[PDB]
Amino acid sequence: TRETKVTVNPGEEYEVKVNPGTRVEIQAKGPAEFEGGGTRTRLNPGESYKFENLTSQPLRIRLRNLSDTPIEFRIREE
């Protein structure tokens, strides 16, 4: 288990990698949009998005900054 932190500029995107059998969680410091697993989710400030890789293949979760200012994402990997 580990954590890191990334910053995304308005309009820009960032991918979060998850390994098979593992899961991740992203907490958004502001409005954000997520894509993965064929689904989409948007967060309010303070909220977090969870994803679990139930496949045999590596997956990636899309981050998008919906705000007018740079957004911080707290990235947790389990």
Side-chain angles (χ1 to χ4, degrees), residues 6-16 26-36 40-44 49 61-73 75:
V6 301
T7 301
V8 179
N9 290 331
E12 296 294 311
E13 297 184 352
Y14 183 83
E15 294 182 340
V16 179
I26 301 98
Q27 185 175 32
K29 186 180 184 184
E33 180 175 292
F34 295 72
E35 185 180 75
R40 290 181 175 170
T41 299
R42 287 188 172 184
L43 300 182
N44 298 306
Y49 174 76
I61 300 82
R62 191 194 303 276
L63 311 180
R64 181 182 291 163
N65 184 356
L66 298 177
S67 176
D68 295 319
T69 65
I71 188 166
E72 297 177 358
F73 291 107
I75 308 300

